[PDB]
């Protein structure tokens, strides 16, 4: 994207896997539009199956 | 015809019969059904315990 | 102790091929629990017809079938403790029956309304 | 172990809160939580239905009944159908809310004026200014013997107005064959023989890309302008041939008509009324007095 | 001709037009600069619900004392859009500004805590995490309150329970004036969609 | 040798203090040392026992006797045996504290309420909401010529209570097996010819996906519901068979039970409690009160 | 969990609009708008001359 | 180019494609100075054909 | 993991080591949570060990 | 689409003109001009002499 400011935009963004114009009329799946499943996706949950060192206090 | 949250009348096949456990409805044509679109089970009942039967 | 179900509705109706109208079958969740601003009861014809329902014309829907989701925001009915409904289910008049001008025993309809569950889950 | 400072001095703004209006970026709310990483899961089985909900494409295409007017067999040719309803016959083209009535509480009296949305006009009112293609389902409640042709044409521009001192409404002496042909004039004859519906979806056309969401909301007398330019035109349901029906079945059949939009976009997230969006909220007794939420700011 | 009374179905769209994307696009390339398709966005933004509201010094004020009258006006976002919604879900941020036209202390401080919807202040802890501000080096308090809900989605409805989700606590030792705004977190949204209700627009009271 | 800056202004909030709530996050804390780099170093030889001792399951899982009843040759069949403890028979299921006791001291009373918390309801108490799988161990205080059978069954949803001014209890009346049929109930019969005990883990089962951690916490006639929204239910000791016991040996045995939970999950650092966690310091006389904490914030 | 800081004092100067009259720069005008990345496009069939 | 601040100058430079001295009398076109069709050059409009999470406010 | 900030979360994760559901009630040991050795893993030790000239007033 | 906040508190010193007096250093000096990139050229045939 053509910026002129060395950070293009305010925040990362994510990408989504969806196939639908967004303003459409067509139903479109809300899962689609962010992917969070009960996975290592989602920070904590991460650090819960890591085992990292900051979930016991260190 | 794309419309959400309602169904509109509409016709229909012209012959319908939907046996249900031990009800049969004979229909002059095809219900018109509104159903949830994309449901899920929001609910825990099948995660809790199996759903026990008669026997 | 607990369910989970989905409720499925069918109507039969049956008018006589000089009746027409139409009916609107829509739900409301939480109708007798929410505030009167946000019922189906104290809204206009655009926000009743915007509730989810099915389209009921007399010579073109002779039925209608409907499915209610479960509409509880807790992980399952109580079926012992709390005798709370979740989900109102309204038969509106959209146009009324429209008959003949002489009056006669004739110009009416006829309905019956079936219910079941499905999706269910008794467990505890 | 100690260095000095080789960095420079950093130019700023003391200003907390900025962009705290726009629906992107990173937000200094600070969480009453455990972990800064607190973050809910996805919509697996929360809601009933796994559809985005929230979509305006989604809200906007939820149909909802504007029209139910009534068709007798008195009803004249090349005239709009007005038996039934407020704005009979006469359907105007926008996103935008063009019905409204006044409740009158007597004491002097107040005038307090409702709308009836369907759920595309109540997100265009969050709007300033809108673009969409109309699409309107235009379905007659009938019997296999009644029989008749219906016109459905759209006219482009303003449409002919009554006005009054608190509302604002057609003009069914100037929507006749003699004044308002239908000849040059995009259009639908509808023929009822055995047929009832018909879903009339119009592009948007307009010398301007955007029109606006104003619509109904202070329009009368002297207050005329913004609703013209909230609506492209309007479709105007007129008999080409008069409702034939027999003895033997009602003299007069229901004209329904659905309204949504598709292909939405809207401007700006500012709505353009005089006053702040508010939820008409319907008193017990038509006695009493509605509620005025504050706007003042000290 | 049969006697029958059908639907064919039959759709048409007038004036030989162009792609309705294209040209949607092309506009607001000349006139807006943005597109919004979906309301969630307008979620995130933030908005007012009172441009002025008042304390009282040393008292805990849960903000459902404001909230509860908001939420009926249709003047905010969370509010407008929740009339064609019956769940939500998720958590919900508060912006207060300070506006106190009048010096009490020499420190003047504001403190957020948490609390169970729809409970008292006499009913609940000053515990649990809380956020500090000082108005006078900075006037926004930007508080967050995360989903701590016994349920998955919660009803705009009332409800026989009670406390089952969290709230906010708001304190401050001085009597102060605040512009609160408010929107929801990055997982707040709405849950499934019902019809819209009247809207109110102008009154004119005339004399008769 | 002097350029000039590019860069740019830069936004910003006076905080002070952000996230100090949160476990995770840069502490701008000074350290009163010599080093920044100020390490302790890991626990190999520092407490007796290398194991974290401060994770919830460790802790937890410490059990703890929470009943002790007499269980008497005369105790009827299909009644829960009330003798000898202050919820006889009945266990709520849940990690909150379930039990309390009132220390009164008259000089008008003070009518001060003392609990009896287990590991795992200690831990409760930080938080607002639960959700963990309930682990009793019901062992039988007896010898080899004492026989008998025991049912413990599960029973969802609220306990049937006896609602004082100031406590809360059970109500035996209604737990008998005319009233409490034990036939549509997970259930375990235990025989008591040679065995003595049984351990029961109770997985969560609730309409709810947390349940409060209130308990008894101020619980009595006016409040009791967040005592039952606080448990998924109870389990019910009842004699299947009486007490068979010759005149050679004690006519009453001693049922122990001792509670633990697994599978852990607390939501909130907040407790639900009207007032902040308090540990109670048992005064050296009776007649003396006991110390209130400041709550006043000024 | 909570580590400490390492990072150092950053000098400064409190001066809002700073080269404000310049034609380069990032401004810290905040936006009226829904998005923070508002953009008009080109001038591609705006004026009557490319 | 030659500077003495670790950031050369204050914005991201975009180019261009003109071929005129920019101070001559020359015709040059507006369309080639910069260059924002309706495509993913602007950052918006790329987000959208992306479906990126945050436009569903994700 | 998926977020929207260019810094995924407050601190720099160090892994552990452990096998077990730090929930449980399974006994975990505390010298797997995190490692810290009398070793170069501290901070301080290290620049002893490497004799860095700062631990010299340099 | 508003993520939160991951970034530390940062210390701080609010003294302008730190370094003034030093020949090398970024200058805050706001320039009353056009083109932050506001450079001389050389001396190429400035002087009498190079």
């Given at each position: 994207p053509t ?5 293009i935009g305010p925040i990362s963004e994510v990408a989504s896997g969806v196939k639908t114009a967004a303003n459409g009329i067509e139903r479109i799946p809300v899962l689609g539009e962010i992917a969070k ?22 | 015809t794309n419309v959400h949250n309602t169904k509109l ?25 509104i159903d949830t679109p994309m449901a899920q ?15 | ?49 915007g509730?989810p ?72 | ?21 726009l629906y992107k ?17 996805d919509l697996r089985?929360?809601f009933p239905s796994a559809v985005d909900e929230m979509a305006i494409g989604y809200v906007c295409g939820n149909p909802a ?28 083209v926008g996103m935008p ?20 949305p369907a759920p595309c006009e109540y997100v265009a009112n969050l709007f300033s200014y809108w673009r969409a293609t109309m699409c309107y389902r ?61 879903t009339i979806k119009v592009p948007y056309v307009s010398?301007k890309m955007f029109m606006k969401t ?16 909230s609506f492209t ?25 659905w309204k949504w939009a598709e292909d939405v976009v809207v401007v700006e997230p500012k ?28 | ?8 179905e039959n759709t048409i769209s007038f004036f030989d037009s162009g792609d309705p994307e294209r040209m949607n696009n092309e506009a607001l390339m000349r006139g807006c600069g943005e597109q919004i398709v979906n309301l969630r966005p307008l979620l995130r933004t ?31 976002y969370?509010?407008y859009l929740?009339?064609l919604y ?98 929801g977190?990055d997982?707040f949204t709405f849950g499934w969609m019902i019809?819209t ?12």
């Open positions: 910026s002129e400011n060395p950070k499943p009960v996975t290592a996706a989602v920070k904590w949950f991460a650090d819960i199956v890591g085992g990292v060192a900051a979930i016991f206090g260190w | 009348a509409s016709t229909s096949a012209e012959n319908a019969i939907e046996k249900e456990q031990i009800t049969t409805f004979h229909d002059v044509e095809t219900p018109n059904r089970d929001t609910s825990s009942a099948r995660s809790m315990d199996d759903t026990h039967s008669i026997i | 102790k607990y369910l989970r179900c989905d409720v499925q509705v069918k109507i039969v109706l049956n008018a006589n091929p000089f009746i027409a109208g139409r009916l609107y079958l829509a739900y409301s969740p939480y109708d007798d629990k929410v505030a009167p601003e946000r019922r189906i009861i104290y809204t206009s014809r655009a926000g009743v017809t509730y329902g099915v389209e009921l014309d007399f010579q073109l829907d002779n039925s209608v079938e409907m499915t209610i989701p479960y509409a509880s925001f807790q992980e399952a009915y109580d079926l012992v403790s709390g005798n709370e409904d979740f989900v109102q289910l309204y038969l509106f008049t959209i146009a009324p029956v429209l008959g003949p001008s002489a009056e006669s025993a004739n110009s009416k309809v006829d309905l019956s309304v079936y219910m079941w569950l499905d999706n269910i889950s008794l467990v505890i | 172990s100690k260095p000095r400072n080789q960095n420079q001095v950093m130019p700023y703004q003391n200003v907390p809160g900025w962009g705290y209006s970026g990173i937000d200094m709310s600070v969480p009453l939580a455990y972990d800064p990483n607190n973050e809910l899961g089985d929360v009944i504007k029209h139910v007017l009534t068709w007798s067999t008195t009803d004249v040719v090349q005239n709009p159908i007005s038996n039934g309803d407020d704005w009979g016959g006469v359907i105007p809310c063009y019905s409204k009535t006044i409740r009158a509480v007597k004491g002097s009296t107040s005038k307090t004026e409702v709308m009836d235009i379905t007659v409640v009938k019997t296999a013997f009644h029989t008749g042709r219906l016109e459905i044409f759209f006219e482009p521009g303003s449409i002919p107005t009554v006005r009054t001192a608190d509302n604002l409404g057609p003009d069914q002496t100037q929507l006749n064959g003699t004044i308002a042909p239908s000849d040059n004039n995009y259009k639908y004859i509808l023929d009822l023989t055995n047929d009832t519906e018909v010398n104003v619509g109904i909301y202070g329009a009368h007398d002297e207050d005329n302008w913004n609703f013209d330019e035109g309007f479709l105007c349901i007129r008999p080409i041939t008069k409702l034939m029906a027999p003895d033997t079945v009602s003299q007069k059949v229901s004209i329904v008509v709505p353009l009324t005089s006053g702040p969006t508010q939820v008409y909220n319907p008193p017990a007794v038509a006695r009493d007095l509605v509620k005025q939420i504050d706007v003042s700011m000290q | 001709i049969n006697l029958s009374n059908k639907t064919d933030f908005r007012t619900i009172n441009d002025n509201w008042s304390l009282a010094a040393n008292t805990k004020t849960p903000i459902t004392d404001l909230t509860n009258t908001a939420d009926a006006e249709g003047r905010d969370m509010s929740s009339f019956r769940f939500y879900r998720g958590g919900r941020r508060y912006k207060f500004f300070n506006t106190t036209p009048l010096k009490q202390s020499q420190t003047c401080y504001v403190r957020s805590f948490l609390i169970p919807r729809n409970y008292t202040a006499d009913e609940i802890n000053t515990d649990g995490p809380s956020h500090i501000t000082y108005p006078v080096i900075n006037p926004v308090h930007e508080v967050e309150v995360p989903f701590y809900s016994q349920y998955r989605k919660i009803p705009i409805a009332s409800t026989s329970d009670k406390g089952y989700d969290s709230s906010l606590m708001y304190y401050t030792n001085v009597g102060t004036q605040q512009i609160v705004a408010r929107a977190n997982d019809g209700p009247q809207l109110q627009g102008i009154t004119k009271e005339v004399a008769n």
